[PDB]
Structures are given as structure tokens and as C-alpha cells.
Design a protein that fits this description.
It is classed as transferase/transferase inhibitor. 36% of the residues lie in helices and 17% in strands. It has ten helices and nine strands. Helix 6 runs antiparallel to helix 8. Bound molecules: the ligand NC(=O)c1ccc(Nc2nccc(Nc3cccc(C(F)(F)F)c3)n2)cc1.
């Protein structure tokens, strides 16, 4: 509904990142409004032929509105790069939260998973699978709530896509890694992995090699440290089913006794 320009902003502190662009804290000059400016170089994009995933990323996040789904405001682009005007999440990533504490207690773990479910429950309702729920794509709002960002690798569902893969499978279901066709259940496997990683402090399928992990994932080989309670073990075991149709619906997850017992 309106076109901006790099001149309308005052870039600030580097929030971070790598490859195509660095996300900056920026300031809309007219309203003094705070936000994050994600800078992507065309040379990076073009050469990797991502044009469509950025057009997809920018189009979906372009509408979705949820408390837990980081907002995309619009964009613009000069000679050598494209800019994405994003919402700014005050508390950073959930990834640093985890490095910071090592592991989370059943309360945040129960909360993020809930917020995450309500978050996914929304995109699913619009046949939009995320397919990329790693803690690195999870941010925190000023109140500390989870906010799903980066809808790049996102697509509609059901889908068959096999896209030369990101480096890590750690968060992908047996169906996506095996190149096979998949649907919305793909985000439920991820939610299970993301839950385990929160409590144990490491992903359920972590290995040393790409091939080692792929083996561990496809045979769904995961064990529990002693401190993980039956309550969580249970939930994580219902999500980590090799066969998509056996994973729960997001209501059953928001209902799980363990989630209700510790979600604030
Ligand atoms: N290290 C801090 O103190 C810190 C980090 C991030 C933020 N907030 C924020 N909001 C929105 C976008 C964004 N970029 C960003 C950073 C890393 C990864 C990603 C990714 F795109 F991968 F999700 C985006 N970062 C605030 C403080």
C-alpha cells in the first residue's frame, strides 16, 4: 500500500546473521517507529536461485497475522539489494535463550510449545506448512513470547517439493528427507523435536555427519535423559512417529496433560 526507500530509515545495531543479508535494528524517520531491516543481496539470491522462495516468503508472511508469527511490513530494493521491513523482536532468538541456559524447564518448554502450536494452528488453517521450525527461526517479543519468523522455506499444503536441502535435517520428518511427498504433519514432527531440544538441550537426532543423522531420523532413533519426565516423554513420543497420520492434531497437543499442567 506504499513504497519505501533506504532513505526512510536509519539503520542501527546489527542483530546479526549471514549469507544473503544482515538484519539491522532500524528507525522509520517519519514516525520514529522501531523495526528490523533484513538486507538481502541480489547476487546472493540470484546465484542460488531463491527468487521464488523470497517471493513466497515475502508473500505469505505478507498476510499472516498472529501474535506469534513475526510480521512482514513490506519491502523495497535499490541497485544491488532487496530490503525486507520486519517486526523487531526485543528479546532475540530462542536459540540464544537455549545457549544461555543450556536447557529449559517444563514451564517455558510447555509455554513456547503452546504459543508455537497456536501459531502453527493458524498457518495450517490456511494450508501453509512452515517446514522450518528450528530454534533459530524462533524470536521473542518484549513480553518474552515466541514469534515464528522467516517463512522462506515455507509452502502451501499438500506439497511434494524436494529442494536441495539446507545443511541440517535435524528438524525434518522422515518424509521430507526421503524426498517423498508431505503435508502439514511436517510441522508436528518438528514441534516434537523442538520440544525435546528445549528440555534436553540438544536435538533428539543430533549426529556428527549428515548421513549419520539421516539414518537416526529415518529409523526414528531417539533416547531420553533420565530427568525427562514421563509426561513430556509421552508427548514427544506421540509427535515423533515415522508415519505422519499418527502424529496428533494441534488441539490434542494444546490438550496434552503435560502441556496443560505446565503452560502458563
Ligand atoms: N542478539 C540479539 O540481542 C538480538 C537478536 C535478534 C533480535 N531481534 C530480531 N528481530 C527480528 C529479526 C531479527 N533478525 C534475525 C536474527 C537472527 C536470525 C534470524 C532468522 F531470520 F534466521 F530468523 C533473524 N532479529 C534482537 C536482539
Amino acid at each position: 500500500k506504499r513504497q519505501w526507500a533506504l532513505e526512510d530509515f536509519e539503520i542501527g545495531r546489527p542483530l546479526g546473521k549471514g549469507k544473503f543479508g544482515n538484519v539491522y535494528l532500524a528507525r522509520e524517520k517519519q514516525s520514529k517507529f522501531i523495526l528490523a531491516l533484513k538486507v538481502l543481496f541480489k547476487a546472493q539470491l540470484e546465484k542460488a536461485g531463491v527468487e521464488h522462495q523470497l517471493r513466497r516468503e515475502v508473500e505469505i508472511q505478507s498476510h499472516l497475522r498472529h501474535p506469534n508469527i513475526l510480521r512482514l511490513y513490506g519491502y523495497f530494493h535499490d541497485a544491488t539489494r532487496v530490503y525486507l521491513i520486519l517486526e523487531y523482536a526485543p528479546l532475540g532468538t530462542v536459540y540464544r535463550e537455549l545457549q544461555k541456559l543450556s536447557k529449559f524447564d517444563e514451564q517455558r518448554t510447555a509455554t513456547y510449545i503452546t504459543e508455537l502450536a497456536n501459531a502453527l494452528s493458524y498457518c495450517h488453517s490456511k494450508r501453509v506448512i512452515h517446514r522450518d521450525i528450528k530454534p533459530e527461526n524462533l524470536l521473542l517479543g518484549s513480553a518474552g513470547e515466541l514469534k515464528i519468523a522467516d517463512f522462506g522455506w515455507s509452502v502451501h499444503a499438500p506439497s511434494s517439493r524436494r529442494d536441495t536441502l539446507c545443511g541440517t535435517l535435524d528438524y525434518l520428518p522422515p518424509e521430507m528427507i526421503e524426498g517423498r511427498m508431505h503435508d502439514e504433519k511436517v510441522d508436528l514432527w518438528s514441534l516434537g523435536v523442538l520440544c525435546y531440544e528445549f528440555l534436553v538441550g540438544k536435538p533428539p537426532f543430533e549426529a556428527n555427519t549428515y548421513q549419520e543423522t539421516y539414518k537416526r531420523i529415518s529409523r526414528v532413533e531417539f533416547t531420553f535423559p533420565d530427568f525427562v519426565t514421563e509426561g513430556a516423554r509421552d508427548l514427544i513420543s506421540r509427535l515423533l512417529k515415522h508415519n505422519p497420520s499418527q502424529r496428533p492434531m494441534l488441539r490434542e497437543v494444546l490438550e496434552h496433560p503435560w502441556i496443560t499442567a505446565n503452560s502458563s
